[PDB]
Amino acid sequence: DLYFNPRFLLSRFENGQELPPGTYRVDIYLNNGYMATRDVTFNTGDSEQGIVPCLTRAQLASMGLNTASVAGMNLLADDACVPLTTMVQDATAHLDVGQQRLNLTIPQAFMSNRAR
Amino acid sequence: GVALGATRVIYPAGQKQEQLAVTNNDENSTYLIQSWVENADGVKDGRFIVTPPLFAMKGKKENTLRILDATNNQLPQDRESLFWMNVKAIPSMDKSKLTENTLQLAIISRIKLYYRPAKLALPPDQAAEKLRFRRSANSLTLINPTPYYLTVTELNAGTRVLENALVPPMGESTVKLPSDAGSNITYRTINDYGALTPKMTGVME
Amino acid sequence: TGGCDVSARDVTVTLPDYPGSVPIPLTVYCAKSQNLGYYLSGTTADAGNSIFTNTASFSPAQGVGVQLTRNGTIIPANNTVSLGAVGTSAVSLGLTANYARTGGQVTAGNVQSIIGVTFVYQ
């Protein structure tokens, strides 16, 4: 079992976590394409990483998500953190801590790709 | 151990951010990296933000720190401002060691963070040559009339080696001078790229 | 080029039982030769600011702390040690770990001390 002496300044880190809850300036990628660089709050949550990003319905929509295709998304508040991985089947979110890059993936069935 | 990718960071005014690489060269080790900014007085200061301020690095890998301008345009616009970046590598150890006698060492790298205004009067490659000197009984004063901090090293007076100095923009710094030190002064500087510049002959004011 | 790197047998030094001393295998090397120096930091218990406190929780030994020496000379906190020119060849920081009494009565127990080693770059 790993140990970190608090006097140097922690259970999460001792358990393999890389980054604690907080707001971080990250590069946001969607389906492996660069989208933006801005602050994103990461809260404690069910994830191998221990933290999950907080992005709103409007933020996701502006990047390509078709909110009308997501069941129950209309019930969310404007400022609610979208539970992406559960609300959008097989959508994923992973933060590459070293690069401070938030990689988001959303299935095509939920993207605004209708013939225009 | 853990090493930084640069020995200083020149932050151009207007830039959204600047980066600093942090590399853990120890494959079997996990470190907690704590970083913070201090002002010229060595006091923790928030005018520049370093993020992530606390994270763990497991094994050999490279992590990038982002440095953000949070000065709200309040810093002088005719000269550089000095800040310090601090990156501390905190080691871990097995909890089984808690019943033993131990000494843990945290390694800290401290480098300069220079805020550099845009459109400065003098080009940076012309600054080092502008340094001037004023000699006193037992002291030597370095005169920096440029908008750039001058890191003076290998400062010699005769055959005597004097203390290194960090001369502030449009300012001065003083170092002790042995009474027997020669009058012939020579010096070198550490430039924007952390390189030692060729020896220059000291010119008196 | 980047900053230098410190190499050690282990940054987690298992100390001999008190009384006893042990050299600390700790070196530093740089990709580009440059004059380098370092200073120690932490919480001390003596007026000399050289004996680092015992932070052990379970059963800490009282009256003793960790004091470092280089070439036999005690190295106080925040007192820069100049190593001179450091290039690609590793240069030892030359440190040895020792135990030093803080003055009080000595009791049985262990010692868990921590020290920071800072390298400031020109």
Minimal C-alpha gap between A38 and chain C (Å) = 27
Residues B107, A113: Cα–Cα separation, whole Å: 51
Q: Using CB atoms, pick whichever of A14, A22, A98 lies closest to residue B62.
A: A98
Place of tokens 């600054």: B127
Superfamily in which the B122-205 domain is placed by CATH: Immunoglobulins (2.60.40.10)
Residue found by looking up tokens 């580009």 in the block? C32
DSSP string, C8-60: ES-SEEEPPSSS--EE--EEEE-SS-EEEEEEEES-B-STTS-SBPP---SSB
Nearest CA in chain B to C6: B1
Q: Do residues B194 and B8 touch, judged by C-beta distance below 8 A?
A: yes
Are the CB atoms for A100 and A27 separated by under 8 Å?
A: yes
> What is the spatial distance between Cα C95 and Cα B14, in angstroms, rounded to a whole number?
45
* Shortest distance, CA A10 to any CA of chain C (angstroms): 16
d(CA C89, CA C93) in angstroms, rounded, equals 13
Give the CATH number for residue C111: 2.60.40.1090
Number of domains chain C contains:
1
**Is B56 touching A (CB cutoff 8 A)?**
yes
Q: Chains meeting A at 3+ CB pairs closer than 8 A? A: B, C
Which are the contacts of B84, defined by CB distance < 8 A and separation ≥ 6? B37, B38, B39, B40, B42, B110, B111, B112, B113
- In terms of residue numbers, what domain contains C87? 1-122
Cβ–Cβ contacts within 10 Å for residue B158, how many? 15
Please state whether beta strands B102-116 and B81-91 pair in parallel, antiparallel, or not at all (unpaired): antiparallel
- Please name the method used to determine this structure: X-ray
Chain C within 8 Å of A3 (Cβ-Cβ)? no
* C-alpha dihedral sign at A9, A15, A18, A23: negative
Q: To which H or E segment does residue A62 belong?
A: helix A57-63
Note whether A5 contacts C: Cβ–Cβ < 8 A. Answer: yes
Q: What residues pair up with B42 in beta bridges, in sequence order?
A: none
Residue that is written with structure tokens 């490659």 in the block: B125
CATH number of B2-118: 2.60.40.10
Per the listing, tokens 């009474």 go with: B179
Subunit contact B58:A16, Cβ cutoff 8 A: yes
- With tokens 């004091």, the residue in question is C67
| All domains in chain A, ordered by first residue | 1-116 (3.10.20.410)
Say whether residue B95 is in contact with chain A using an 8 A CB cutoff: yes
At B42, the amino acid letter reads G
B65 min Cα distance to partner chain A (Å): 8
Q: Among C6, C53, A24, C112, which Cα is nearest to B96's?
A: C112
Is the dihedral angle over the CA atoms C4, C6, B166, B186 positive or is it negative? negative
Q: Please state the domain extents for chain B.
A: 2-118, 122-205
